[PDB]
């Protein structure tokens, strides 16, 4: 039977991959970083509170200039804030209020939105009429949009619950590339600093590293016992961190093709909603359903700090490109900037 | 006051934006949001037509009350990842077709459609996001149920049934079986209505159930209850 032979062959390849990975386990990360000085307790304060959303905040994204911010709430609004003054620069009403993601273009000209309508809407922020207009609507996903990231001004990448990712050419509105291989819903995306690779985590408890141009899956990383909800790249682009519903974060290395470290505690049993690194990459910030955020020592796996101040689930995290501040948004309707 | 002219202009713009946001929130707080659920071709569409590929929204007004109905069918993705986005809905309208007792799923002929409907109902009502959300149950296609019970007893799907092959008893038995799935009887209420392809009291029934839900919530928020 061809099928038996194929299944057996698959198992042989999986065993070969496992053995090749195990052969590269010379020494754990925790043994190498045993002699590193601990960062110490990290204490941060709330500098700003951003009020105005009247429902749960589901996503936010920092502008590349480290000052402007976009947040999305299911009260039907996308708000662009000035974080230094707390002024609301823009308030964009959405045709569909079931938004679950938003993005800020690197040039700052465009914003992206999406959610349960299966559509990625592109809004132009700098027009001659003085308004914000829907410059485009990308359709073609058969499930909800979970994450989007502007790869450029004319290209965007999206992930949805139909188990696939898509690279879209905004000008023509068509989908240029499709990334298939996940067996569950794709929950999060993280572009590489050089933008030539991206990583995605799915509800099948796995992460995949995709090559943008080729349209091929480069690598598959496993180890989480539940859904992966958040994912982020290490600042130098050679490793990433994933958070799941099993109440743990994990750090995976691209070149070793394995998992370097696990970030877990006995007092934490809720899921992880968001993860991001600090500029150096030394600290790993993760938001939880416990209503707060933990700051971990990425190189030693010790809890370095706690950010508390939200009355409901912390849904989204961000760190500015200049490293000055963190932003947290939760289901309590507030965004808070910390430093 | 330490601000330049342009900074004051920007602050005034922010104040106008806040004013607009408050007005929109006030308008939205007065709307009654309903979540429509059903097991595929269960008469849901007939309910929609009578009362009026992602989420679909219907808007209608009865007696000065604005209802927004969200149909979340045609989303063949995991439900647990987006169900929590409907946590604040006033009520869940659940549609069940009474003829399914004599039918099986096309994808699985060994599974009875009524059992699938009961499983979906049980999952929805006992879900952790909807502990206090009431359910309005619409048992559609009652006419066709009266024309088949006399020939196809409920023992086909309900072996323990020991009643007559009359609609009056079979309908009550089915309503009991569906209300036995509620394990939170101290927090949520279930409203049941028998309807058919030619019924006009469907909107009035929804109005009454939603009014009861709203008044009970107000009382619970004011004490008393």
């Amino acid at each position, epitope marked *: 039977s061809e099928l038996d032979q194929l299944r057996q062959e698959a198992e042989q390849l999986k065993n070969q991959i496992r053995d090749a990975r195990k052969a590269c386990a010379d020494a754990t990360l925790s043994q190498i970083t045993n002699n590193i000085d601990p960062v110490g307790r990290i204490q941060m304060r709330t500098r700003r509170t951003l009020r105005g959303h009247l429902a749960k905040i589901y996503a936010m994204h920092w502008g590349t200039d480290s000052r402007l911010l976009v947040s999305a709430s299911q009260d039907g609004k996308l708000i662009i804030w000035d974080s230094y003054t707390t002024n609301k620069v823009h308030a964009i009403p959405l045709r569909s209020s079931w938004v679950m993601t938003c993005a800020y273009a690197p040039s700052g000209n465009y914003v992206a939105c999406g959610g349960l309508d299966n559509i990625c809407s592109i809004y132009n922020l700098k027009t*001659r009429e003085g308004n914000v207009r829907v410059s485009r609507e990308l359709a073609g996903h058969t499930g909800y949009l979970s994450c989007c990231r502007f790869l450029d001004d004319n290209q965007i990448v999206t992930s949805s619950g139909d188990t696939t990712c898509a690279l879209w050419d905004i000008e023509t509105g068509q989908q240029t590339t499709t990334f298939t291989g996940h067996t569950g819903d794709v929950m999060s995306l993280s572009l590489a600093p050089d933008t030539r690779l991206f990583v995605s985590g799915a509800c099948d408890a796995s992460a995949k590293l995709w090559d943008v141009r080729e349209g091929m899956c480069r690598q598959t990383f496993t180890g989480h016992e539940s859904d992966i909800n958040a994912i982020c790249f290490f600042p130098n682009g050679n490793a990433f961190a994933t958070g799941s519903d099993d109440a743990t974060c994990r750090l995976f290395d691209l070149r070793a093709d394995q998992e370097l470290m696990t970030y877990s505690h006995d007092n934490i049993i809720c899921g992880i909603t968001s993860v991001s690194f600090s500029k150096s990459g030394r600290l790993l910030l993760a938001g939880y359903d416990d209503f707060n955020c933990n700051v971990w020592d990425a190189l030693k796996a010790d809890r370095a700090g706690v950010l508390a101040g939200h009355d409901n689930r912390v849904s989204c995290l961000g760190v500015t490109d200049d490293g000055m501040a963190v932003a947290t948004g939760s289901w309590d309707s507030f965004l808070k900037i910390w430093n | 006051c330490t601000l330049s*002219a342009e900074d004051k202009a920007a602050v*005034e*713009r922010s104040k106008m934006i806040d004013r607009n946001l408050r007005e929109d929130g006030e308008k939205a707080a007065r709307e009654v949001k309903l979540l429509l659920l059903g097991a595929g071709e269960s008469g849901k569409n007939t309910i929609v037509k009578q009362m009026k590929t992602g989420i679909v929204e219907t808007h209608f007004t009865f007696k000065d009350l604005h209802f927004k109905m969200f149909d979340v069918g045609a989303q063949r993705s995991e439900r647990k990842k987006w169900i929590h986005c409907f946590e604040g809905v006033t009520a869940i309208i659940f549609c069940v077709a009474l003829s399914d007792y004599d039918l099986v799923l096309a994808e699985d002929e060994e599974m009875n459609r009524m059992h699938a409907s009961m499983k979906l109902f049980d999952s929805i009502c006992n879900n952790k996001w909807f502990t206090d959300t009431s359910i309005i149950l619409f048992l559609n296609k009652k006419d066709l149920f009266e024309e088949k019970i006399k020939k196809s007893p409920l023992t086909i799907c309900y072996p323990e049934y020991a009643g007559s092959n009359t609609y009056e008893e079979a309908a009550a038995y089915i309503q009991c079986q569906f209300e036995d799935l509620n394990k939170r009887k101290d927090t949520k209420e279930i409203y049941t209505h028998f309807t058919c392809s030619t019924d006009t009291k469907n909107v009035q029934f929804v109005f009454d159930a939603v009014t009861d839900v709203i008044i009970k919530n107000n009382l619970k928020d004011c004490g008393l209850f």
Partner: single-chain antibody, 234 residues
Framework: DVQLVESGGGLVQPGGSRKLSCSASGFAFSSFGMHWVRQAPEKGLEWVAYISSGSGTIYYADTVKGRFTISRDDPKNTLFLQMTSLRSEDTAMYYC??????????????WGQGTTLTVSSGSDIVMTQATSSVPVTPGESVSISCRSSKSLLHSNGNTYLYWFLQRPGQSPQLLIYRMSNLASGVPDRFSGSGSGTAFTLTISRLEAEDVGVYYCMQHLEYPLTFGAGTKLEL
């Protein structure tokens, strides 16, 4: 297409009253604040009045305060200036200017065409442009200087200096909206720099289309003040 059309000018007797109107088309009129700026036959620009979006804040230049009233009609997309007790010094061409203020915006980015109104019979910042005219040749670079009596650098880091250009027989047009910020649609050959109280506008590869009068404005505090205007020739 963005369009501002002004009407209501003409000849009026001293002591009379005329109403000027500015009809707007092709943009979100209610989101913009509006200015009325005049240019007497002396070709120097004078800011007259300002009404914000939402009509919350209204400012007048002292020379006209108590005689002019500025108002808006958002549903009809029209701006109004009510002028009473007219004096010969009110003869001028009046321009309707739109300006929108938020972080990173570009104020004074579109000017109207103007209405010619003819009448028969201390703490303000002073902006100086020493050179009135400069003979120039195509293909060569030119430098235009502006001086301020008070530093235009604010504690927030912005230098509120605006450069405008007016070609023969046309409305002024924005070139640099904040020291070193080129305006939308402006050729890259124009560049600006400065410090505190001394500012420079540099033009590279001069073109025949770049001949006109260059104006310097400060937006640090009301009333808004313009320069005398530097003229390019040949």
């Amino acid at each position: 297409d963005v369009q501002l059309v002004e009407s209501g000018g003409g000849l009026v007797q001293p002591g009379g009253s005329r109403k000027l109107s500015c009809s707007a088309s092709g943009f979100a009129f209610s989101s913009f604040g509006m200015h009325w700026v005049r240019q007497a036959p002396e070709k120097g620009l004078e800011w007259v009045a300002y009404i914000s979006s939402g009509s919350g804040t209204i400012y007048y230049a002292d020379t006209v305060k108590g005689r002019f009233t500025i108002s808006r009609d958002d549903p009809k997309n029209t701006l109004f200036l009510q002028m009473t007790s007219l004096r010969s010094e009110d003869t001028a061409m009046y321009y309707c200017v739109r300006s929108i203020y938020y972080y990173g915006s570009s104020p004074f980015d579109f000017w109207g065409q103007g209405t010619t109104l003819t009448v028969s019979s201390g703490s303000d910042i002073v902006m100086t442009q020493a050179t009135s005219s400069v003979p120039v040749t195509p293909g060569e670079s030119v430098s235009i200087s502006c001086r301020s009596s008070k530093s235009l650098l604010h504690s927030n880091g912005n230098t509120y200096l605006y450069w405008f250009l007016q070609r023969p027989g046309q409305s002024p047009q924005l070139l640099i909206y904040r020291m070193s910020n080129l305006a939308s649609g402006v050729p890259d050959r124009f560049s600006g720099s400065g410090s505190g109280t001394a500012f420079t506008l540099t033009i590279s590869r001069l073109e025949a289309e770049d001949v006109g009068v260059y104006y310097c404005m400060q937006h640090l505090e009301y009333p808004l003040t313009f320069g005398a205007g530097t003229k390019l020739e040949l």
